[PDB]
């Protein structure tokens, strides 16, 4: 599964979390077996103004 979020919301991409990303965008199950991989992409996904 792939998407973009702000750095402070990366903590919500984990089992049993709450907050606007975990609640309204992407919810993981509590028994999640898997890996969560993230990296800062401000050199590509970001623009002046």
């Amino acid at each position: 599964d792939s998407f973009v979020i702000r750095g402070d919301e990366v903590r919500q991409i984990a089992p049993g979390q709450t907050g606007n990303i975990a609640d309204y965008n992407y919810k993981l199950p509590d028994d999640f077996t898997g890996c969560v991989i993230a990296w800062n992409s401000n050199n590509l996904d970001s623009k002046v103004g």
């Binding site: 089992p15 049993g16 979390q17 709450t18 509590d30």
Partner: protein, 49 residues
């Protein structure tokens, strides 16, 4: 005072049941002994521990 053998059988059972109920008040190292209190203070993965 002659019936001490029978009265002590009542006393030992009352003392054992009160001890079993009093142990509901103990923390066993948890944040609180009130089970709904844990579920208010903490989110799912921390509350489960």
């Amino acid at each position: 005072s002659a019936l001490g053998k029978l009265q002590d059988v009542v006393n030992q059972n009352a003392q054992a049941l009160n001890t079993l109920v009093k142990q509901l008040s103990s923390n066993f190292g948890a944040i609180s002994s009130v089970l709904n209190d844990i579920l208010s203070r903490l989110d799912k993965v921390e509350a489960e521990v």
